[PDB]
Write a protein that binds this ligand. Structure first.
Ligand SMILES: Nc1ncnc2c1ncn2[C@H]1C[C@H](O)[C@@H](COP(=O)(O)OP(=O)(O)OP(=O)(O)O)O1
Ligand SMILES: [Ca+2]
Ligand SMILES: [Ca+2]
Ligand SMILES: [Ca+2]
Length: 341
DNA sequence: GGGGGAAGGATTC
DNA sequence: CATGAATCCTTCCCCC
């Protein structure tokens, strides 16, 4: 089995560079403006010119301007990036019918029956980078290995605008030298739990009784890491379909007033329904972000589909339930629809 | 005991 | 200061 992972470089900002080439070379910061005070919000992503100085995804726009006050700041345009992404995704289909689209800018290709070895896979890589660079003017990093995880790790090491292969020989090496934290699916919270257990590299997970592992990070995460350490991880490439659709907005100011909140909530439902387009949900959840960045939610599944009318009234109750069951103020309110018919 | 779904949350990218 | 969706976990609950 041979996997080829494609990851587009600094995607949102690169698409803005493509649409306005006079930007290539200058630090570009794509942000989400919360409408609260001035320049309130966060950075969705930034090109590398900007990342050299610490401006990256997740930091306040405010801290970014303090560092790069003259950089170009642009408001995120998700719809545009999505259509550009869809076109690139369609180009990849012509290289394998077995393709897994993991996110707006990541995709795994199962190229076992289109190639015989790593030389041809690597070659197919350059061919794909070029096809995309020509047709869309988007540079992408490619990763190639025996399974999805290592394909992705490969790209993580080769980005930006790179390509790298991790042969079986190097796979066994990494399982021993690679920092467990660099393994996809291992975030700051799990990496921490892993250190207290003394597990610092993939291999280390073998010198520990599975039961203590399952207890600390869960069974799923345990079997996952153990199979990667044993080098028997071989999850297939599957076409994934939406199981959920929703939206959450930020308020001008925190609140607990049902009447002051409703507008934002209804706005979220209107936009969610628009995205459902033909899909009908049997379940709805109202999600709130408390004044201290905590997340609470109340839901309800119905035996039948939900009409926009029902959604509107039901969401109000679930919101009231949240207020009744939590004294804190709400910072962000929103809805989520799932269990489509 | 244990299947199976539902609800609220934890984590990750 | 702090802007969509998947997968997994724990606890309930109904029930044969
Ligand atoms: N914190 C975030 N907030 C909003 N969107 C995000 C965030 N992190 C990532 N994204 C989105 C927008 C990015 O362009 C896209 C690509 O995934 P990402 O992990 O960030 O790849 P990257 O390291 O190559 O840079 P880039 O973010 O520009 O693509 O995912
Ligand atoms: Ca990515
Ligand atoms: Ca990317
Ligand atoms: Ca990590």
């Amino acid at each position: 089995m041979i996997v080829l992972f494609v990851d587009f470089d600094y995607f949102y900002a690169q698409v803005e560079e493509v649409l306005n080439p006079s930007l290539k070379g200058k630090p570009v910061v794509v942000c989400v403006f919360s409408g609260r005070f001035e320049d309130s919000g966060a950075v969705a992503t930034a090109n590398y010119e900007a990342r050299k100085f610490g401006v990256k995804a997740g930091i306040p726009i405010v801290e970014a301007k303090k560092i790069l006050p003259n950089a170009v700041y642009l408001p995120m345009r998700k719809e545009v990036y999505q259509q550009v992404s869809s076109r690139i995704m369609n180009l990849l289909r012509e290289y394998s019918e077995k393709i897994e689209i993991a996110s707006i800018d990541e995709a795994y290709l199962d190229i076992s029956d289109k190639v015989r070895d790593y030389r041809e896979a690597y070659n197919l890589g350059l061919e794909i980078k070029n096809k995309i660079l020509e047709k869309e003017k988007i540079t992408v990093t490619v990763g190639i290995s025996k399974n999805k995880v290592f394909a992705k790790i490969a790209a993580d090491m080769a980005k930006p605008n790179g390509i790298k292969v991790i042969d079986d020989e190097e796979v066994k090496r990494l399982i021993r030298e690679l920092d467990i934290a660099d393994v996809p699916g291992i975030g700051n919270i799990t990496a921490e739990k892993l250190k207290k257990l003394g597990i610092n590299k993939l291999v280390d997970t073998l010198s520990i009784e599975f039961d203590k592992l399952k207890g600390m990070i869960g069974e799923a995460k345990a079997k996952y890491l153990i199979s990667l350490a044993r080098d028997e991880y071989n999850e297939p490439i599957r076409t994934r379909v939406r199981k959920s659709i929703g939206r959450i907005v930020t308020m001008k100011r925190n609140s607990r007033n049902l009447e002051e909140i409703k507008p934002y909530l209804f706005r979220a439902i209107e936009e969610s329904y628009y995205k459902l387009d033909k899909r009908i949900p049997k379940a709805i959840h109202v999600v709130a972000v408390t004044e201290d960045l905590d997340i609470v939610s109340r839901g309800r599944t119905f035996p039948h589909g939900i009409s926009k009318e029902t959604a509107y009234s039901e969401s109000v109750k679930l919101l009231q339930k949240i207020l009744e069951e939590d004294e804190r103020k709400i910072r962000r309110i929103g809805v989520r629809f799932s269990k489509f018919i």
